[PDB]
Design a binder for this molecule. Structure first.
Ligand SMILES: [Ca+2]
Ligand SMILES: [Cl-]
Length: 838
């Protein structure tokens, strides 16, 4: 318990602790750590004269050691640090070691007076502690496939840490596994459809008090303008649910219920489309889960992503056939004639995380360091990887980066029955200042986005034709008002629609007798067509008007068929195309032609909130950041400042939904990619949206101006809801902990098995969390009582708003990534085998 901490020290009555008080020890929850300092009764001032101790704290390992072997190692170490040329071996006795320590002590106090400070000794003792297997990674091994090498799970009933107890920490309650059993309804994924421990400090989203706080935070983000700036035009309109497969899926009912109660998205498409919210949910069970739950949010179409990636973007010898582009999707686009698609979705080829950091890892693991752990890169590894990356982008033969980006975007931006999401890093450089440098594909993508507003409407037909040595796909939109190939349309149908012709093989050669006959639809008999995009020897030629293409007009026949031959279609191999891209639009669309349609106020009657109809198809999502954006050097280069200045560009592209980066002030621990490039996903304060300090994207005021500028053009703005984990807490806590895998299963024969461990898991209690934490739970329970009545699926009980989280503490977390502090960091009395409690 509390004894006296010392025949280990022969200056025992000088070096013994000032008093029996707690104020004379650097403790964590009244326990002592190998790095704990204390106030002795006397200091050996300048290693000369025993002086009698104000702010004169000294290391405990100066005068106390857990084992005699540790004293030896401490003597050997500090001898080498202070220039004492003498080591002591295995057979040395206790008197020799005590005199060695009572010499080290003297020279320590000499250097404290010479150097006039103590930092050097903090670093020297820390360094010594990290050499001992019981106080470093050695006792935390073996490592597992956790992104940060391993995790520890906080025990629900800890006799020595009752303040860290919980009746919850219910793990792996993914949408698939929400009830603690695999859902029998969803068979596309044989697994439990995710895992609890992803990164850093894992928030216990099974805790009813934490569930209430996540809703509190959700309300805050959807009212950020009203709350921060008393400005109702600066609110986030929508959310992205980050890391769905790594959190308790009760948050999906909580967020869906909130959108229904607060925004009325279930009433009609106008409400739903004004607050269009998305998941990042990787399991193939999550889409059908979300559909049954009421389409309160939309998921990615992961099948179409993989179809694009493997048909178009992969290297030439790893490339699949093209037919997946038609059939391997939530929607079979062979003949899509539906007023409303069965399931709503968003579609993409890349995102901030998907096919960016994966490519940087491939480059690092290849040409620099093969022992890289997950995505835990150093900034130097990143900077040099990007020299290889940026050169590969402009190569015809790419070894690392995507082929056929423009072919992918031609399908994404003409496909029916999905909301396309354009990735920032496909129009601008993944690195560098925001919107500073255009990619070689910027023009093609910009042309398609403007064309989409003007031409892309009506039913869809995709065909896969075997011709010459290879294959092509055609994708057609029949024009506004023409759902079917037989619809003869009105005037606007005639001057809308589009044909996309694509091949994914550079050797594609048509025989002289080969015809590609593309049915444009019954509205397009005997009609002039002109190119929008054509593949050339060196890249892609874009056509910004009918007149720019005046020389390349061709005609449909009396059956409404465009016909192409060897003269028109062949394989190419340049930095932009590896195969063929041709895009054709009808001649004579007015300069201001817009075939998009607004969401109706008519009541929804199918029990779903979001409907993949012409109104949702008219939307475009923009992922408005890159992980590897440069840090701003001046205020004009801040992302949110550039966004406000360039908002006219987004409206011109038909961006309806601007997905902003997470706006939380980033932690700087560098324990993951996210906390090295400071994207916003690694944070300590959920409510610090550039308030205490700028985020990577600017000040809180810069954010407010960015949201208002986007709102000024009718553009909705999405907040990144990130309830899975938090990084780099400033206050230590002692927890009873067990070494686990990412699923929370206890490991082999770990020395960390219901033992004390020192976590960084307490917030300051003086941050934005302390101000806004649970601040809106009374307002929410008053307006929307049904939210707090619902018995959540994973727990069987409602959210508990009776407690407010002003300070994060281990009792609200499942556990943490291993911190390299070891299984024995909390000091015991050698004799009693008892943890020191003060
Ligand atoms: Ca989790
Ligand atoms: Cl259909």
């Amino acid at each position: 318990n509390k004894d006296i901490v010392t025949r280990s020290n022969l200056y025992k009555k000088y070096n013994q602790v000032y008093d029996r008080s707690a104020q004379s020890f650097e403790h964590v929850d009244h326990y002592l750590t190998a790095e704990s300092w204390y106030r002795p009764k006397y200091i050996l001032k300048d290693g000369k004269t025993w002086t009698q101790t104000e702010k004169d704290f000294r290391p405990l390992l100066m005068t106390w050691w857990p084992s005699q072997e540790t004293q030896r190692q401490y003597v050997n170490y500090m001898n080498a640090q202070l220039g004492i040329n003498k080591t002591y071996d295995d057979t040395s006795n206790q008197l020799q070691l005590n005199i060695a320590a009572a010499t080290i002590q003297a020279k320590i106090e000499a250097k404290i007076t010479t150097l006039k400070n103590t930092d050097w000794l903090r670093q020297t003792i820390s360094a010594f502690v990290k050499t001992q297997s019981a106080w470093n990674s050695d006792s935390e091994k073996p490592f597992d496939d956790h992104l940060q090498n391993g995790a520890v799970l906080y025990d629900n009933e800890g006799k020595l840490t009752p303040y860290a107890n919980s009746n919850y920490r219910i793990l792996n309650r993914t949408p698939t596994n929400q009830t603690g059993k695999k859902d029998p309804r969803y068979t596309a994924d044989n697994t439990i459809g995710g895992y609890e421990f992803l990164l850093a400090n894992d928030v216990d989203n099974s805790n009813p008090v934490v569930q209430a706080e996540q809703l509190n935070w959700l309300h805050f983000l959807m009212n950020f303008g009203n709350i921060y700036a008393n400005d109702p035009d600066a609110n986030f309109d929508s959310i992205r649910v980050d890391a769905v497969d790594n959190v308790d899926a009760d948050l999906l009912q909580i967020a869906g219920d909130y959108l229904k109660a607060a925004k009325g998205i279930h009433k009609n498409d106008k409400a739903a489309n004004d607050h269009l919210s998305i998941l990042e949910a990787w399991s193939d069970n999550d889409t059908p889960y979300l559909h049954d739950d009421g389409d309160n949010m939309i998921n990615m179409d992961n099948k179409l992503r993989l179809s694009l990636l493997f048909s178009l973007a992969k290297p030439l010898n790893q490339r699949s056939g093209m037919n997946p582009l038609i059939t391997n999707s939530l929607v079979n686009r062979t003949d899509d004639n539906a007023e409303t698609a069965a399931v709503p979705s968003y579609s993409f080829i890349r995102a901030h995380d998907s096919e960016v950091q994966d490519l940087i890892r491939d480059i690092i693991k290849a040409e620099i360091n093969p022992n890289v752990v997950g995505y835990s890169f150093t900034m130097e590894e990143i900077k040099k990887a990007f020299e290889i990356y940026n050169k590969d982008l402009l190569a015809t033969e790419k070894k690392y980066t995507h082929y056929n980006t423009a072919l992918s975007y031609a399908l994404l931006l003409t496909n029916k029955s999905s909301v396309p999401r354009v990735y920032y890093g496909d129009m601008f450089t993944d690195d560098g200042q925001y919107m500073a440098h255009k990619t070689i594909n910027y023009e093609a993508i910009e042309t398609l986005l403007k064309a989409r507003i003007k031409y892309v409407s009506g039913g869809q037909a995709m065909r896969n034709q075997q011709v010459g040595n290879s294959e092509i796909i055609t994708s057609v939109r029949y024009g506004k008002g023409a759902l079917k190939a037989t619809d003869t349309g009105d005037r606007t149908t005639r001057t809308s629609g589009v044909a996309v012709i694509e091949g994914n093989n550079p050797s594609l050669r048509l025989k002289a007798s080969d015809r590609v006959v593309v049915n444009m639809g019954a509205a397009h008999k005997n009609q002039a067509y002109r190119p929008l995009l054509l593949t050339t020897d060196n890249g892609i030629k874009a056509y910004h008007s009918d007149q720019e293409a005046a020389g390349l007009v061709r005609y449909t026949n009396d059956r409404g068929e465009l016909i192409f031959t060897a003269a028109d279609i062949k394989g190419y191999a340049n930095p932009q195309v590896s195969g063929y891209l041709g895009v054709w639009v009808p001649v004579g669309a007015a300069a201001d032609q817009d075939v998009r349609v607004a969401a109706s106020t008519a009541p929804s009657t199918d029990g779903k909130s979001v409907h993949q109809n012409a109104a949702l198809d008219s939307r475009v999502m923009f992922e408005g950041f890159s992980n590897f954006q440069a840090f701003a050097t001046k205020k004009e280069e801040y992302t949110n400042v550039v966004i406000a200045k360039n908002v006219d560009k987004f409206a011109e592209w038909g961006v309806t939904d601007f997905e902003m980066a997470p706006q939380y002030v980033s932690s700087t621990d560098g324990s993951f990619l996210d906390s090295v490039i400071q994207n916003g996903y690694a944070f300590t304060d959920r409510y610090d949206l550039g308030i205490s300090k700028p985020n990577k994207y600017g000040t809180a005021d810069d954010l407010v101006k960015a949201i208002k500028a986007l709102h000024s053009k009718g553009i909705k703005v999405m907040a990144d809801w990130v309830p899975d984990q938090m990084y780099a807490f400033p206050e230590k806590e002692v927890v009873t902990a067990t070494r686990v895998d990412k699923f929370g299963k206890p490991v082999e024969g770990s020395q960390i098995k219901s033992v004390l461990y020192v976590a960084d898991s307490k917030s300051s209690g003086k941050d934005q969390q302390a101000k806004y934490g649970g601040a809106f739970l009374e307002e929410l329970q008053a307006k929307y009582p049904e939210l707090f009545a619902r018995k959540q699926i994973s727990t069987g009980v409602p959210m508990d708003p009776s407690v407010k989280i002003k300070q994060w503490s281990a009792k609200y977390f499942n556990g943490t990534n291993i911190l390299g502090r070891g299984a024995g960091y909390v000091l015991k009395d050698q004799a009693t085998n008892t943890y020191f409690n003060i």
